[PDB]
Symmetry: C5
Subunit: 311 residues, 5 copies
């Protein structure tokens, strides 16, 4: 069992095809996702060619150990894929049709910049290291690339499973390697975020702003500070479902901007009381009345500013 | 070892039967469940047929590698099932009776719309890919489909384990595939939710409404805000035991509706104090007295509205 | 390799014996426990008979694949046990003495009704499916059933590891199956619960009752509400270490009863203030003075009522 | 492949030696720790003896399957060790020198009585079941027992890896068993506890005592209660990193004693206010002034009492 | 299959080379990281040498079991690496060129002293134990040591993957062992820490300092205490993402220093109120006015002191 010799001096083209059966467990923090799929391979091994008329048989079946099969591996995987050979069928001309059903945990980076209104492009890289006798090149059999209709990724909308037809062939440790890119495009289901996180986070912020329609320092302190504790409960809840990014996220920006609205609200509450104690409530009431319009306006504008920078 | 040749031009019917031994680990967030069961298969392999008289035995045992066994796989599984072949018996006419004991983590979507008063239909899909020589079709042997009496799924009531007798035969990658549906119907045990989550969540909401039988702004602020913090503790507790659904859940609706009752309560508390400070407590007391009846009524009606829309 | 033929028409008795080496990881929420033990089996396979004069050895050793060994499996396990064959010894008559050391995660339901003062009976079910040639029956070798002295299950006291000597033989999928029950009786170590959960939970409840020796509504509100937040912290801590039971637990009952004592305390605090504001502190002080005795008495009686119903 | 026959009627001594390469993952709650080590075995198999002058080669190498190797197993392990045979060397007299590199999760109970100032003795039990032909006895080759210099157990100081030279030979299920004890003595690195848990826990307790230099009930209530909520946050943090012990721990004692200092502080705060309202602040101020000295003194003495009982 | 005999009395040099494909899962608490890489080995086995003329081939492919391959293992790993042999090529002079693709969880200690502005040096130790026949020595083939461009370690910047060319040869359990050090230098991505943890932690500290521009004890108590609760929420969040170090970390120092600023702030708040009640607000206002400058100054200086000691 060794590679098939070439007719002329040409490299062996292996026709690939991934058909997704299952898509599950997309870990945002770990930037991984689990996949269960069919892997279909096809090459020309002339040593296995036969006559169809005299044999009576049109297609010949083989066991994996009986024939030479190319060493196809995934690049961005945690461990080696759990493969179960489905079928090996040889045509009269010597064209092998290999099929296996695998399962693997794929390592694909995610861009959290527009979270939770973000979209992602998941990658599945097929690689084949060329042997000494002859060079091995990968090819996409678009007929054998797909996904079933039931394939559901919890909390995500699956757009398209496509493959970059042209492989990226390169030199690695003195040998040629043919690499293929299978792209799974997805968009996040941002519905749940609005009633669970966005709106409650806004209510607690507006509750803090009732301190502008009050002169009671003790009550105002309780208002701005207590809601700030509620806001801490919400920030810690969101920042845990996300990994530590070296960039600003859309959520992260909002979360941080809100922390300033709590700080400036304390400043106002402190100032209003300081002037009241300093026997000048004509000065305090004017600031407090300005804040009634200033805080919602500056908030609404700053959100438009951020939404523009991010989308 | 190859498929048995057909007498006429008919496809091979394989008689299936799943008998549940164990049902455990139903992950709501991951929409999975673990199963430990018997898988029983039966087909007609004429090449194995024997005259009982000459052989001197009316049953023939075979090791898996000795005879041709159909490649039966599960569709909605994480990895390939952990199978242990129990027995293979051949009757005189060549009817094989295969039995194995497997364990697999099944991927079955759950509908959380009526949670925790929801019911579910778990699926176990058996699939067989037809070979080149002949086509393979799946069949249900209702005599061999069941579950033992001890089978308990923690926090759920097991209704029925049944199978859709008619398989869904279709074409996939130019080959025929026969798919079978085993349905495990379950209903949730919603008892624990009432004393642990529902009632305490209602008490904290009613505690906030005592601010209608009080004129003290500082006390009212403490009442509505503190209880809101308690409510945040309960929402975060529930939304973690649930996945991020692109639809509204019965719990999610209630949870969100309660967040409004806290917001409107702050508005009232702010208004009552604003009028009191503006030297018109005849206006404030009338609103506060109205809210004493308005809040419980609007809450009870809104709950009837939601319960109607959801059930 | 097939079962030994019977002398007369009798079933094959297999002498079982489980000797616990390790007991660990009792997951209350999952109702599982890990075990590491010796499994000892014994049957008469006359085919393996030998003359020690002609063979030279008094007792013959064999590799698992060389001789017929009964397919003994556990019923209530997650996956198939991790077995390592220790020794196989055959005596001149053909009496096989099999020993293996296994490890398995056992699925045994727990009754949380009297938690954390509950006791449990863990089960380990041995099963053997009878072959077509002859019937297989399981038997208990009480000499080979035990546990070592060091065997410790963290947070539990191990009472006894015993076996139901009479197997439950029944019909399953056209064949006979002999089932054996190994019972591991345990009682929970409830010590830690008193200083960590019970007493702190009582202190925070009594702290709320200081609102009966105070007329300050603003202080009383802070007292009853803040301690309620502390109580929420403790309920969520306990209800997480427990699964969602369709029945009431001893802890669950107490936890819920305490939530009422917080609710009724708010009512009192609201009433006392309402009467004080309504210029009748002779009415308010009488209720507040009654509550000083009413709350500890009703609590003490309700605990006796619950403890009676549960024990 | 069977045990070597004895020269005179003596048992086979197997010279053991464990050399720790890695020590990691000490789970306090689970009372486990992971180990990666060399296991070195040595016995006299006269059947493998050879003439050194005639053969020409000093030492002869063998594959595991070629020669008889004793079935050495670990007692206190979760699953069977992950062993890779390093080398098998046979001297001319027939003395076998076996070496393997294993990795295993060890189950060793921990004594939390003096936590986090506690020391532990981890155990690694080697066992060998004696065969029918002859008895097997374990022996310690102190030259082959050790640990490398880099071996670090996060948060612990490794004292000594020693072995009890005398094995505990006993009868189990009719056969003799030779058990050996490898002890890994460790002491906890209690540094981190002081700035992270001990001191912050003391600050929050002292902050509650500022209520003795104040007559404001509303402020005192906020002081004692808020700091109690902070203390609950710290107790829940510590009690989670620890398992549920049927005995009192040094930390557990302190934690509980602090819960009393919070309770008695509330009593004082309630009393001081009750007397103030009852028009006798000469009585209230005297108690409050006494508690300024009483609370730090009783705390300092009670800590000396506990530290004495525990150390 | 035994080691190749030496020409003269020299040890066998094995030319190593690690090429990182994947770098992921750097567990700070566990001080581990997962790696997926190519391992390339090269030695001179004269017994495999051949003439290229009569062969008609420049290279000879071998199966792992066919030829002698050195027992290369990793020192600082949890379990034995998951290796898949890629290719084994033999040149005419007998120089073997071995390549495998492995995946392993590496145990490398981390220095948290400068966290989260810390840098790390990850180690991958290759070891080979010398056989009885001849000694084995490791060597670095710098041509075969690298990493691909896509290699990303979430939250870290990968500086350089280099190897210490000189192996550390030493005696262990009466045999020579050659050890090699592969160093992966990384620096933390400290960006996320500033908007998520550092700045919010500073805002809550400054919010507590508004108690210097207020005379209301009840408000000041609420200010300092509530923000202290927010600070506890942040300390517990940071100290969990870190292991228990027997040394002070840069974060740990800050965290602890902040706990003092909260304590001294309570002292001030207590003193200001005590003097106010003791009818001397000329003394209280002077301290409160001093604290307005004292607290930001001492904080700014103490941070410069710590930053100097740590960097
Ligand atoms: Cl792979
Ligand atoms: Cl499957
Ligand atoms: Cl089993
Ligand atoms: Cl290794
Ligand atoms: Na092959
Ligand atoms: Na077969
Ligand atoms: Na308050
Ligand atoms: Na057998
Ligand atoms: Na052997
Ligand atoms: Na070899």
């Amino acid at each position: 069992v060794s590679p098939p010799p070439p007719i002329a001096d040409e490299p062996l083209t292996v026709n690939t095809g991934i058909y997704l059966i299952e898509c599950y467990s997309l870990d945002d923090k770990a930037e991984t996702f689990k996949v269960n799929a069919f892997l279909s391979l096809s090459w020309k091994d002339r040593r296995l060619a036969f006559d169809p008329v005299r044999s009576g048989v049109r297609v010949k079946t083989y066991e994996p150990e009986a024939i030479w099969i190319p060493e196809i591996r995934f690049v961005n995987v945690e461990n080696a894929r759990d493969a179960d050979v489905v079928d090996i069928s040889v045509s009269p001309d010597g064209t092998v049709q290999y099929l296996e059903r695998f399962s693997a945990r794929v390592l694909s980076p995610l861009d959290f910049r527009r979270y939770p209104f973000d979209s992602q492009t998941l990658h599945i890289y097929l690689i084949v290291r060329s042997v000494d006798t002859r060079n091995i090149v990968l090819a996409v059999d678009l007929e054998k690339v797909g996904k079933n209709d039931d394939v559901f990724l919890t909390g995500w909308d699956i757009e398209s499973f496509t493959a970059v037809v042209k492989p990226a062939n390169f030199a690695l440790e003195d040998r040629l390697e043919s690499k293929l890119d299978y792209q799974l495009r997805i968009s996040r289901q941002y519905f749940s975020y609005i009633p669970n996180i966005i709106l409650p986070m806004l209510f607690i912020l507006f509750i803090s702003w009732t301190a502008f329609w009050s002169t009671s320092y003790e009550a105002n302190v309780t208002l701005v500070v207590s809601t700030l504790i509620a806001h801490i409960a919400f920030c810690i809840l969101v920042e845990t479902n996300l990994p530590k990014t070296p960039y600003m996220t859309y959520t992260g920006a909002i979360i941080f901007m809100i922390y300033l609205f709590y700080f400036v609200a304390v400043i106002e509450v402190t100032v209003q009381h300081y002037l009241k104690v300093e026997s000048q409530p004509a000065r305090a009431a004017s600031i407090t009345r300005a804040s009634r319009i200033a805080f919602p306006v500056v908030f609404l504008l700053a959100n438009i500013i951020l939404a523009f920078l991010f989308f």
